[PDB]
Amino acid sequence: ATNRDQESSGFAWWAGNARLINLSGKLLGAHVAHAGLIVFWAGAMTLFELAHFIPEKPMYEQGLILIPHIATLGWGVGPGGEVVDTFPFFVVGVVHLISSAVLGFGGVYHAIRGPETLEEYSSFFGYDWKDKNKMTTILGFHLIVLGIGALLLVAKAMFFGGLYDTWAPGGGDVRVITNPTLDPRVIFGYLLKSPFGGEGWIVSVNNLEDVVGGHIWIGLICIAGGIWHILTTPFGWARRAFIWSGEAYLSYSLGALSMMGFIATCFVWFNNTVYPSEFYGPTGPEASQAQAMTFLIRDQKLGANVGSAQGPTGLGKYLMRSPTGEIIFGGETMRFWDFRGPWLEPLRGPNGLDLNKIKNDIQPWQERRAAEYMTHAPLGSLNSVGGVATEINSVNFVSPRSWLATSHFVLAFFFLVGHLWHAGRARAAAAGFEKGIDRESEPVLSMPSLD
Amino acid sequence: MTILFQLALAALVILSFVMVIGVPVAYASPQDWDRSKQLIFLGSGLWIALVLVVGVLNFFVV
Amino acid sequence: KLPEAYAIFDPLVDVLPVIPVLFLALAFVWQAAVGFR
Amino acid sequence: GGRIPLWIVATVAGMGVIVIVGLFFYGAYAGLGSSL
């Protein structure tokens, strides 16, 4: 047992995986076995979802988060998101589950049977954390792997059936993307959009041409960057700015993943393009807008002139102006006027919601969709009682958007904590005081008094 | 083929359960490792073969 | 539903997603067996 | 004296706790208290 106690390793059992920092062979096993766990869950959870799946209920009424991801890629679904064939869901689940056995095999092998360190065995696979060029080379390999992944999405969208497009003319449908947006002014313009209301940074992407074109750019950027880091070594200014240690690199990635988790939380909460509402349920803004639409339709059918109806406050009961003049739904949903969705856009003209279209052109399918979304708003209890907090038991519902947003905020937050933990520790360890102050060389004792 | 399918898939589950326990025990056992290594080779190949059999037979029972 | 041929394994499919959680608990069984050294 | 290893006692006891608490969560969805 090399390094597997606190006396030899310096680390207690509850920090036991820190015993692996300089054991590249066992550390490879831990990483590969962990990848097996991720892939295991994806496959097993998909098969569980499929076994529990009733195809004539909406996905979002059934606690599904993975089948919605597969369907967004255009597999298994047709017009309006209706399930036409569950076999692709089955294939995705089985192939992941089978693959996790392979990963688990290599992980267990490297972790307890293979060489504990790789450097004696292979200069190619061995590494020193402090070897800066070896680190950028492995980083480069992985950037190329990621770039290929981004191009697999592009290939699916352009040559292997397309993607599910909630915005397709005539109704949502799977659509092949033939003209991805390549203009860098458009693609990188998303990156310079404000994250505040009515702008929404990259979360505002609202068409598949921009999505696919963005992944073309990301694919080439990652492959170029990967080749760059295979061929170069960190410049002097970079060398002086960073801590170069295994724990420091981990802390950098933890900060990156925390940021990505916060971004994914906002993506699933606001975006209804790459998270189609057909699969994930309406967004919070969407359902609130749909309520206003529902009672506008009802009261107008009863004879109300919804354009001139003054509410109790003096604002329009159904329709009012945004702070820049656009005609928007009234009531508390005034806050949600940046919402855009395919059931509502036919009623929008140049100045916002158009009264003549409201009076004459609302179709039954729009009334249906608004009623559906208003009554599947992403509100519900931890034990999955759907509705407001005061609602009685009856409806078993929590929106997938709430499950995905809450889980990823929690994970993003703890990964920010982990970043601070390991970044501060990597700094202290590199400088040599992570185990405490040297009694014979206490820095504050050599400093002048503050007063 | 259904009898061949139900037999191949039940064998795959059983063998998987045997590999799941036996591989880590063999990897961490000092004694009789040469007999273990060949068994693990054999189990692994048989495992891969059963996956392909179930995958093919899938399309003749559905 | 799974394809009908696989229906016999429905009880197994119901349990599989939790197996990763068991790996975390296994680490504690293992550490207990070596005295948390 | 010490014939049964402590790690087995802890593992079996802990599994028993999981079973009983699991039963209690099952009962939240069935019979009394289930809202049904």
Partner: peptide
């Protein structure tokens, strides 16, 4: 309905590995 049986065999596999290795003085 049979689900409990599966969880028992799956749930024992982990501790059984540790027990088999402890019995044979393996490399725990």
């Amino acid at each position: 309905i049979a689900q409990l049986t599966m969880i028992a065999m799956i749930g024992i596999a982990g501790p059984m590995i540790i027990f088999l290795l402890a019995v044979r003085r393996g490399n725990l």
